[PDB]
Design a protein around this ligand. Structure first.
Ligand SMILES: [K+]
Ligand SMILES: [K+]
Ligand SMILES: [K+]
Ligand SMILES: [K+]
Ligand SMILES: [K+]
Ligand SMILES: [K+]
Ligand SMILES: [Mg+2]
Ligand SMILES: [Mg+2]
Ligand SMILES: [Mg+2]
Ligand SMILES: [Mg+2]
Ligand SMILES: [Mg+2]
Ligand SMILES: [Mg+2]
Ligand SMILES: [Mg+2]
Ligand SMILES: [Mg+2]
Ligand SMILES: [Mg+2]
Ligand SMILES: [Mg+2]
Ligand SMILES: [Mg+2]
Ligand SMILES: [Mg+2]
Ligand SMILES: [Mg+2]
Ligand SMILES: [Mg+2]
Ligand SMILES: [Mg+2]
Ligand SMILES: [Mg+2]
Ligand SMILES: [Mg+2]
Ligand SMILES: [Mg+2]
Ligand SMILES: [Mg+2]
Ligand SMILES: [Mg+2]
Ligand SMILES: [Mg+2]
Ligand SMILES: [Mg+2]
Ligand SMILES: [Mg+2]
Ligand SMILES: [Mg+2]
Ligand SMILES: [Mg+2]
Ligand SMILES: [Mg+2]
Ligand SMILES: [Mg+2]
Ligand SMILES: [Mg+2]
Ligand SMILES: [Mg+2]
Lengths: 163, 177, 44, 48, 48, 46
RNA sequence: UAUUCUCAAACUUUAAAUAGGUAGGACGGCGCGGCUGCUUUGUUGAGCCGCGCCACGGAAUCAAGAGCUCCAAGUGGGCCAUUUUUGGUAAGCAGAACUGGCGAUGCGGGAUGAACCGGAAGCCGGGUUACGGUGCCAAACUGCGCGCUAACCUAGAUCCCACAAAGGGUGUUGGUCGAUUAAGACAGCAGCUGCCGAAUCAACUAGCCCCGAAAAUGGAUGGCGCUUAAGCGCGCGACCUACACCCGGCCGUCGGGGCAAGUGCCAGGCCCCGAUGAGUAGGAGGGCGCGGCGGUCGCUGCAAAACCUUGGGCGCGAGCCUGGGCGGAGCGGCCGUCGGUGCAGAUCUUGGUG
């Protein structure tokens, strides 16, 4: 509306990948979606029903409802000075289960056991991750040294493969 | 005692990896005003010549090279590559100095004067101490004379210090060669 | 003022001097400039 | 105790560098753990 | 370190005694910006 | 005619404001069949 | 059929940089039970509920704190710049994208300038700098070094920026490639050749300079001038220079703390500690001033009001207090309350006067 249709500017976004057209593999229809799961919205161009607006393509949201053929997804949308919680329904052909939280569950268990193993011995520790820190000092065994020097200029070589 | 430009050997390598646990070690002889700038120019060449960026490289050693005999006079040849306003060129220059640091300082000063080439547009390819009989430039040959003799045609008239400076004097300077 | 007069073994001192001297030789070592076949004459 | 530790670290680094030199290898110094940062530009025309 | 460093109020240094070279260029180019490694100490003397 | 100049600056004066997140979210718009059964389940809960 | 030159905003297999979304716990996890009309062949699932147990805070950095609501002003002509970018030969032209800037904002530099560089500001002392500078104008070197340039065209002289091109020079300075030469080159001289006895020839390249280069008031590296530059390129040391930074004083604002068997206080006060200060349109607070009214405390013929003054003092300020003079009959402070309550402008009104 107001100068732009629903699918305006979707020539590339909503087109199928090269040599990946035709029948949709059935693993898409065997996925299980639960409330609270995170899903990435990826519009399939072949399915014209229950397809989200182009804005939600490439966005990750949280599942808040499950129907026969579609899942309700909560997606953040920035409008001026506010973030809106947009609730949309999308057919499962356009959603992929996201691996954004794949490390959380396995990390909690490791932290829980590490704290438990430390509680029994009365040693207070921290399970927090840390970013890459500075490396310690070390010795490197001597080896043959290859000398690098600037190369004399040659005009004939100022072209891919030369002139 | 003090030089504008210092010579350094910089040694570095690519970070060890599972495929290459002992990557090749590269060394360069670079000229810079201090160690920090010597390291930066070392990674410039390794990035563009060996495809090893500093982000995936390792600095091993950096040592400053000092003239062996800073009291004698040597002839220094410098092979360099520089960028003009229209392209790149190669040239060979000769200098006479007590240390190669002074000869390199002369080279940068000359390139700025005769070619308007700034420091960052010059790459030093090679340096060497040339024996007198193998020099090529006449500006260096004419001083290879056991009986070198000439007067001071141009003198600078001035008091030893500004303490003896006066605006007015009773007589003009008396100068003779 | 009184002109009052070693912490390394004599053999150790000789090894230290040799190692440092050898390291200095590598510091001033130059490339052979053999990979620049088109500029052999110019590079000398 | 702290004063003694500072002197030992300074001499420890010197010994390791000399040890690597004697064996013909290299000793990579530990990467700096601490930085001091100074602001050198004013507060005018700041990108967000 | 986090608590000890945050406990310190940011240091209010003075204008450097002797001035700067060029704040608009990187220290590698002969300016004053960026990492100058151990040479930050030389600047700390003139600004403290 | 049109321009977005200064609009991001205006938005960031008091924004970007994220909505308040509560432990329990509204059930409006969810499957009525699921909601109706849930209401009965709570009714007979003991 | 196998090759080949060159291409695409409305072509594309492939495919960046930058930017975009989500997640990194106490709203977590596990165990045992329960509810249902939904779901399953199935207490099978789904969600929820109860009880018990565990949960060192589950990347970094910061956090002058976070959330919520009400009422309302002004605004809805914009402009400039780096970069991306459309129309146009182009425009100090027109139109978009991200950010900053001006507008609303002084201050130092750019001679001069809304936007360029630096940098944002209470009132001061000291110190040090930013950009920019150190021959005079003009605070700081005719400082210490190397080279280049010589302009008989007004040589040249600093981001934006106030212009210059193709093409040329046996001007001069560097460099690159090649050729020739003590077995004698080159020029001249001599009859391919002899004398000749030391360097010579050719092309290319790029610094400065010169040609190319024509406009109307007399004129503009800002001016004067400058050539062992005071020009150009690159250095070194010192020095000069902001309302910027640092230390100190004082004012305001904001935040924090102390003060009762009260020797106890305009507590609406006193004292102590920390940070901080730009402002048009606009909002609000605390104050100043004018004329009444209800009260209260006073002044005045031993001189009220008004007015005059090169008298003096207080307050950041609106203003206030007071000396002297003139004048000759009224006037003021304080609390509350009220209003036809504050002028430099309106081709403002009336009167007066240059
Ligand atoms: K269109
Ligand atoms: K409006
Ligand atoms: K020329
Ligand atoms: K009264
Ligand atoms: K008076
Ligand atoms: K009143
Ligand atoms: Mg309409
Ligand atoms: Mg629109
Ligand atoms: Mg249909
Ligand atoms: Mg700026
Ligand atoms: Mg401060
Ligand atoms: Mg000083
Ligand atoms: Mg400066
Ligand atoms: Mg800038
Ligand atoms: Mg209007
Ligand atoms: Mg408009
Ligand atoms: Mg217009
Ligand atoms: Mg306006
Ligand atoms: Mg100007
Ligand atoms: Mg001052
Ligand atoms: Mg001079
Ligand atoms: Mg030309
Ligand atoms: Mg001037
Ligand atoms: Mg102060
Ligand atoms: Mg203010
Ligand atoms: Mg009154
Ligand atoms: Mg008067
Ligand atoms: Mg009064
Ligand atoms: Mg009235
Ligand atoms: Mg009125
Ligand atoms: Mg008037
Ligand atoms: Mg007015
Ligand atoms: Mg009038
Ligand atoms: Mg009139
Ligand atoms: Mg008249």
């Amino acid at each position: 509306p107001a100068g732009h249709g629903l699918r305006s500017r979707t020539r590339d976004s909503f087109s199928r990948a090269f040599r990946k057209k035709g029948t949709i593999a059935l693993s898409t229809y065997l996925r299980i979606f639960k409330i609270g799961d995170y899903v990435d919205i990826k519009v399939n161009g072949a399915i014209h029903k229950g397809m989200p607006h182009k804005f939600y393509h490439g966005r990750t949201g949280r599942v808040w409802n499950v129907t026969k053929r579609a899942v309700g997804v909560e997606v953040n949308k920035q409008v001026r000075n506010k973030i809106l919680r947009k609730r949309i329904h999308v057919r499962i052909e356009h959603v992929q289960q996201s691996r954004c939280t794949e490390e959380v569950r396995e990390r909690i268990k490791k932290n829980d056991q590490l704290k438990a193993d430390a509680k029994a011995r009365g040693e207070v520790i921290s399970t927090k991750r840390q970013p890459l820190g500075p490396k310690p000092g070390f010795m490197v065994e001597g080896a043959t040294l290859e000398t690098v020097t600037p190369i004399p200029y040659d005009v004939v070589n100022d072209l891919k493969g030369g002139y | 005692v003090t030089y504008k430009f210092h010579q350094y050997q910089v040694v570095g390598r690519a970070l060890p990896s599972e495929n290459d646990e002992h990557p090749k070690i590269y060394r360069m002889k670079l000229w810079a005003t201090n160690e920090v700038r010597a390291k930066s120019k070392f990674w410039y060449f390794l990035r563009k010549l060996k495809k090893v960026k500093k982000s995936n490289g390792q600095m091993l050693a950096i040592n400053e090279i000092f003239e062996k005999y800073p009291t004698t006079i040597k002839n220094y040849g410098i092979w360099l590559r520089y960028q003009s306003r229209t392209g790149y060129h190669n040239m060979y220059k000769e200098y006479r100095d007590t240390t190669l640091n002074g000869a390199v300082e002369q080279m940068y000063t000359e390139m700025a004067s005769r070619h308007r080439v700034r420091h960052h547009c010059i790459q030093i390819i090679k340096t060497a101490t040339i024996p007198a009989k193998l020099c090529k430039r006449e500006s260096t040959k004419q001083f290879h004379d056991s009986k070198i003799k000439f007067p001071l045609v141009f003198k600078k008239v001035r008091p030893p210090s500004r303490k003896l400076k006066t605006t007015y004097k009773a007589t003009k300077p008396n100068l003779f060669m | 003022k009184e002109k009052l007069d070693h912490a390394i073994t004599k053999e150790e001192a000789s090894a230290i001097k040799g190692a440092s001297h050898s390291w200095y030789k590598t510091m001033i070592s130059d490339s052979d400039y053999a990979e620049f076949d088109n500029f052999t004459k110019w590079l000398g | 105790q702290y004063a003694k530790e500072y002197s030992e670290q300074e001499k420890e680094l010197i010994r390791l560098k000399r040890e690597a030199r004697l064996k013909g290898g290299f000793y990579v110094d530990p990467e700096a753990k601490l930085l001091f940062i100074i602001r050198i530009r004013g507060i005018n025309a700041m990108p967000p | 370190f986090k608590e000890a460093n945050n406990f310190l109020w940011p240091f209010q240094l003075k204008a450097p005694l002797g001035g700067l070279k060029k704040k608009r260029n990187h220290y590698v180019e002969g300016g004053d910006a960026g990492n100058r490694e151990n040479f930050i100490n030389e600047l700390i003397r003139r600004m403290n | 005619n049109h321009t977005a100049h200064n609009q991001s600056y205006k938005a960031h004066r008091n924004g970007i404001k994220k909505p308040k997140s509560h432990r329990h979210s509204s059930t409006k718009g969810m499957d009525p069949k699921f909601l109706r059964n849930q209401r009965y389940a709570r009714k007979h809960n003991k």
